[PDB]
Enzyme design. Structure first.
Site, PDB file in Angstrom:
ATOM      1  N   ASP A  82      12.290 109.507  -1.946  1.00  0.00           N
ATOM      2  CA  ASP A  82      13.233 110.276  -1.046  1.00  0.00           C
ATOM      3  C   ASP A  82      14.471 109.502  -0.572  1.00  0.00           C
ATOM      4  O   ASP A  82      14.323 108.401  -0.018  1.00  0.00           O
ATOM      5  CB  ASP A  82      12.557 110.741   0.251  1.00  0.00           C
TER       6      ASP A  82
ATOM      7  N   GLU B 137       7.901 119.449   3.429  1.00  0.00           N
ATOM      8  CA  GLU B 137       8.395 118.097   3.572  1.00  0.00           C
ATOM      9  C   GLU B 137       9.915 118.073   3.659  1.00  0.00           C
ATOM     10  O   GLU B 137      10.556 119.027   3.282  1.00  0.00           O
ATOM     11  CB  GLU B 137       8.038 117.294   2.316  1.00  0.00           C
TER      12      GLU B 137
END
Ligand SMILES: [Cl-]
Ligand SMILES: [Cl-]
Ligand SMILES: [Cl-]
Ligand SMILES: [Cl-]
Ligand SMILES: [Cl-]
Ligand SMILES: [Cl-]
Lengths: 523, 526
Positions: free
Chosen positions: A54, A235
């Site tokens: 990420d 998420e």
């Protein structure tokens, strides 16, 4: 005190952060030293060594662009989470920075998970991130145990930070483990945080908190719950206001959804990120006005994070390799980010994510091919050897009788290639990897609206890097990002028409510069 | 011209048929002598030399299976039409017969077009065929001028036939040129005929005539009009009753339709053949109970003709190359027929066209792989050089996570191949030629019903010949037939899984026997 929202942060040091950083630097350096550059990006962000995932802590601050990212400094698969860091004065020339965070507090001892950065009322940056613990104290098998943390930079260069500890604890009995990925912003006179949660009933939610000093938080409400009960977790949530064509503000909610079942061409990856557009009265629930749509329709894209700089909302995604085989992992790195994109709303009211304007500065040259016509089934070489190039092309759909047509990229001497095509039977733009000799294959197909099909023209802007392709459709109305692990030798690009003619109104190739992160590069 | 059905046939010989036949035989033998066999079929019917198209005069008669076909004996593109002929006792070992028809009557002077053969009440065969002229006396710019003709075999072996002449003239005032492809059958005490017509208002139609003696015909009505105004003409019409296992008959109307526009996966070829199922009372109009469906979903299939023997309805198609480039046309031949298929109705009431059971007799051997698992994206080699083979495989749809999976055939050293795959995003079986180095490319996708997609299993039976593939899905519930012009060198076959696992419950390869039609004495394997 077991108030879910402690009145002052809970700071619990258990490791020497400097020494943990030094060990992470060593791990990255061992991998960088043996790195194979065959698929390593020339103009996308990757770690110099090791696995990343990420994007984190995205900001522009004190005269620089900053990108941080989840990093495993000890191998090319996922493992103990750190934050890596690159910076730039221009988005074109980047430098590697010290690793920023290693686990050093009790509540993050099993990983420094994703987080963001925001500039406060005084112009000072604050970081928010999730601290991860294994729920069983060991490994993934008993699930996650997650809380929210905060830290402040020590210097304007953001090369180090002072952690302040846990600011939002997890109420265990109200959550099914997942509890992560904060975003903080100010609306009106109030600061808000949202992050993703799996409810006690296993539904994916985004929770809302408010604060007056950015440190002590108060629970407000559930901001949004995903309408599909198969979706158990959201998420990397995003939430920001974007100006529509009439000059009115719309709220665009974003998340990386876990649990959706694939359906047709939709939700095909292991987990899938996307958005809905709607309204928000500040402090209230998000009210969606659209069904869920993908940020990116390609094979490899997840966990996008966005930030705001001078009225522009800019977003990076991680090009996620969730499917075996992942042959770049043998090469001392794994994972790159997409180019930076700008989030806008188009004339049809839908999100558009074109590359940011600064990406034009990647171009070393322009090779203008003019108008090209293939009269029947066939192929034409556009480039005999393309390592890192951008192709811009406009196809005349109304004149072209080909059933399928576009560009074969990474077209090597063994006959492998990745095919970027308009497919007229389905009315979509595909990236198809069936002929690739390395990596998993398959195809992904991005939708075109009735109006886009009726228009008579189709624009593609195609970025090829050493191990990847990104296809921007109609100015980034849709995007497909995918790994493409070219075979050995010269990598051609070919224009292709199948079973009919192809009229290309304009075709331009640009060679791409290096963003300076690969260091010295060969040929 | 309200008597456009003469009481007695009109016979107008203009050339010596025996001499025209002898000239055509010389044309074919010369192409055959120089033919290049790289894509030439080992087990499909082609001309020994020259271009072919529609299957014609199909029958079983006096102990033999007969296949005729439209033939241009002087080149490898379409040209002056003749009928060629092959025969067999067993559908497995065929013999090349004499050319059967060459243009020699006024009303067919520019071509002996398509036609059929039926056995009369005395058990004697009769041919019906369309005679072609250009309307303007010299070419197509003036359109077609077509009438119906009849002929009788000279012997039980059908090595030759005697023409009788025209039995149905064209009321040219009523029709827009197109007027061809007759089929005759009996229902009750009465003989019927249908053929394809473009109406004055340019609507594709099929007409119905009746007869009690087979030579004198009488107009009854328009049997069927295609409901899509884009469709101007219905070539090679078919009309046959098909039994379920329930003991009912449905009538399956078939046509090779011109004028339809492509839509999604449907009607992608230049012209497209298909069917509707419904009901018919003798003399009346066809009442369709289904929408139009393709006979064959592949790249290269047109002009099917079916015939009846002993309660079986058997169908052949021509593998039609309508799209440039057509690489085989440089090789002294062009075009082949499909394998013979049996028409049945399946459990959902839809048409099924499995290969006829006699096709099992093509297998020289069986290489049984058992069950094969790919745990993730990958390929396994099934053959390194498969010239003519049949692959049978059953995919476990319930367990396979692959997004797309199947067989790459003609997979040559240059990286070219043709891909036969189940595609889980579209819920279809495809033939994709994108990676082929010769021929036009593109893909074709055959539908799977909701029940088929929720089945735990998918069956594929794939026949690779030197220049082709035919893919029979779920026992022939759909079929895709496509030319595949393999590059040089060894031609691999690979099992492929993309982006997930592939569980195959049974996988078997069979080498295919020659059907004895490729024999050419100037070609020295040597
Ligand atoms: Cl979709
Ligand atoms: Cl380059
Ligand atoms: Cl390589
Ligand atoms: Cl369809
Ligand atoms: Cl072999
Ligand atoms: Cl073989």
């Amino acid at each position: 005190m077991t108030d879910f929202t402690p009145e002052t942060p809970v700071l619990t040091p258990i490791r020497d952060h400097a020494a943990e950083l030094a060990k992470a630097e060593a791990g990255v350096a061992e991998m960088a030293a043996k790195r194979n550059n065959r698929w390593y990006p020339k103009y996308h962000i990757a770690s110099n060594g090791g696995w990343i995932n990420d994007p984190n802590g995205l900001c522009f601050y004190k005269g620089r662009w900053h990108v941080f990212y989840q990093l495993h400094p000890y191998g090319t698969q996922w493992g103990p989470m750190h934050w890596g860091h690159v910076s730039s004065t221009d988005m074109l020339n980047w430098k590697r920075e010290p690793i920023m965070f290693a686990p050093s507090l009790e509540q993050e001892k099993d990983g420094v998970f994703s987080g963001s950065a925001v500039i406060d009322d005084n112009g000072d940056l604050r970081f928010y991130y999730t601290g991860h613990r294994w729920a069983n104290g060991h490994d993934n098998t008993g699930g996650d145990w997650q809380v929210q943390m905060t830290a402040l930079p020590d210097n304007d260069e953001l090369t180090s930070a002072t952690k302040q500890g846990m600011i939002i604890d997890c109420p265990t009995d109200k959550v099914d483990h997942h509890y992560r990925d904060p975003k903080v912003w100010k609306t009106g006179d109030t600061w808000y945080m949202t992050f993703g949660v799996s409810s006690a009933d296993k539904r994916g939610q985004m929770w809302l908190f408010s604060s007056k000093d950015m440190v002590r938080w108060e629970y407000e409400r559930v901001l949004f719950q995903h309408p599909d009960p198969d979706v158990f977790m959201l998420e990397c949530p995003d939430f920001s206001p974007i100006k529509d064509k009439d000059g009115n503000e719309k709220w665009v909610i974003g998340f990386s959804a876990m649990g959706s079942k694939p359906s047709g061409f939709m939700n095909r990856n292991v987990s899938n990120a996307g958005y809905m557009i709607g309204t928000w009265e500040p402090g209230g629930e998000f009210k969606p006005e659209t069904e869920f749509r993908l940020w990116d329709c390609g094979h490899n894209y997840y966990a996008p994070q966005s930030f705001n700089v001078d009225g522009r909302q800019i977003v990076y995604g991680w090009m996620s390799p969730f499917v075996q085989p992942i042959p770049m992992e043998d090469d001392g790195w794994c994972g790159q980010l997409t180019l930076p994109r700008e989030i806008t709303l188009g004339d049809d009211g839908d999100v558009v994510t074109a590359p940011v304007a600064e990406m034009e500065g990647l171009r070393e040259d322009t090779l203008d091919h003019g108008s090209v016509t293939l009269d029947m089934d066939g192929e034409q070489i556009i480039a005999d050897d393309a390592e890192a190039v951008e192709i811009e092309m406009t196809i005349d759909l109304a004149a072209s009788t080909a059933e399928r047509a576009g560009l074969k990229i990474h077209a090597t001497e063994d006959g492998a290639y990745t095919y970027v095509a308009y497919d007229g039977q389905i009315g979509r733009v595909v990236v198809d990897r069936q002929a690739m000799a390395n990596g998993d294959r398959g195809y992904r197909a991005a939708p075109l609206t009735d109006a886009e099909l009726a228009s008579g023209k189709l624009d593609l802007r195609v970025f090829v890097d050493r191990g990847s392709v990104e296809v921007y459709v109609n100015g980034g109305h849709q995007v497909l990002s995918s790994y493409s692990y070219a075979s050995e030798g010269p990598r051609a690009i070919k224009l292709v028409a199948e079973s009919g003619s192809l009229k290309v109104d304009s075709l331009k190739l640009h060679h791409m510069k290096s963003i300076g992160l690969e260091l010295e590069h060969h040929h």
